[PDB]
Task: structure prediction
Amino acid sequence: TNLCPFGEVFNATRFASVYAWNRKRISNCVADYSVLYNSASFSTFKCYGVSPTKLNDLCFTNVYADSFVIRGDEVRQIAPGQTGKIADYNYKLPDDFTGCVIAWNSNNLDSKVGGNYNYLYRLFRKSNLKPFERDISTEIYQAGSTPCNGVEGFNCYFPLQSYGFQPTNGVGYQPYRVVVLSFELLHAPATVCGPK
Amino acid sequence: VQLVESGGGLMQAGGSLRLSCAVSGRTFSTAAMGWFRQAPGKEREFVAAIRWSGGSAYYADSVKGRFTISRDKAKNTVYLQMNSLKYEDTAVYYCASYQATRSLLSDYATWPYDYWGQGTQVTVS
Amino acid sequence: QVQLVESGGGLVQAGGSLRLACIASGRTFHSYVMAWFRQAPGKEREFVAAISWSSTPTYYGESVKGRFTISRDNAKNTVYLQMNRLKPEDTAVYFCAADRGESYYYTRPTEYEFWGQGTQVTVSS
Ligand SMILES: *[C@@H]1O[C@H](CO)[C@@H](O)[C@H](O)[C@H]1NC(C)=O
Result:
């Protein structure tokens, strides 16, 4: 049948900010993972609950492709059982995740001479995200006892901040494009199968 | 982005003046606009910053309680309401666009701006 | 903060056998892909073997396929490397590594978060 549109996810011209991470539902298609196997220059390509050697042999009810930009030092947070600013406040994988996480250095696309400030992350939140929770609110964060009433000041902060992607950045501060493939297996008919 | 200031001119000490700055081009809603000033023989001085979304303001100690920065999202305009003007306030007033979203509004007092206008002359007597 | 401790290293005659063991601290062992790397005198770390959560698949470096066997005992938090028909070129420090993920790029050291300090193997002619 027709191939899952991994092309539209991995090769998108524009990627989301991690706080406003993008989800594409994939279903009713053949997932030929050879487009990912034939790439040598991903910085990371790991699967959880399933061997990457089995992807072309398995069937799922749906696949979800989540995509966003973070910085180099944070790529390790896109894994089960991780904590930090991204896993806590921006994008949380469950501990029982079944799927794959791919990232690559995008410094040639996502940095610019005077700095690219287009990509944001959430710096502050009252509590940690649940797995696959998305928070796009811009409510002023109350860091103290005195309420803010939507006015910034002492202990009253805007919750989002720009990554500063300058081409002179160290690898830890360079931009990485991330795709997370979640493999959903419900008590329902499979609509995504590998070519076997 | 392109910035064009107007409203400048000659004012009595104690008086009231409103500067305008018309913004055209790709601004970020989470980011900020600022006013800075330069008197002759002196270095650039930060005056005020405002976050485009939310409208929270941050002021230099020298203008706090006297000047107010505001913006109209409809008209893509930032205002500086200059009340209780002093001799000291004489300078070229410049509008600035910051592309960077900073969590701490006070950051805009020192964070390099990306775009600035030609400016408008303000003289106090 | 999982610790890995390698053992079974030592001196062995060429043609001989050696069994390495690596024990992980904690009760997480079942959730880890386990791997062996080695660093031969004055060379970079080289991939030796890896084993998936369920014991399949197993992976081997070109140099050791047919001679080495990787296995795991989840009840003992232990991964084993059975080394047969040892050559002088197998002289190296053998490092245990673990990760929650199974990498498509299973030979890359950067795909494994957790590392032991290594066990010395010397094969004498
Ligand atoms: C993305 O485009 C490249 C061409 O630059 C192509 O080789 C690759 O297979 C595409 N990736 C996916 C996942 O379709």
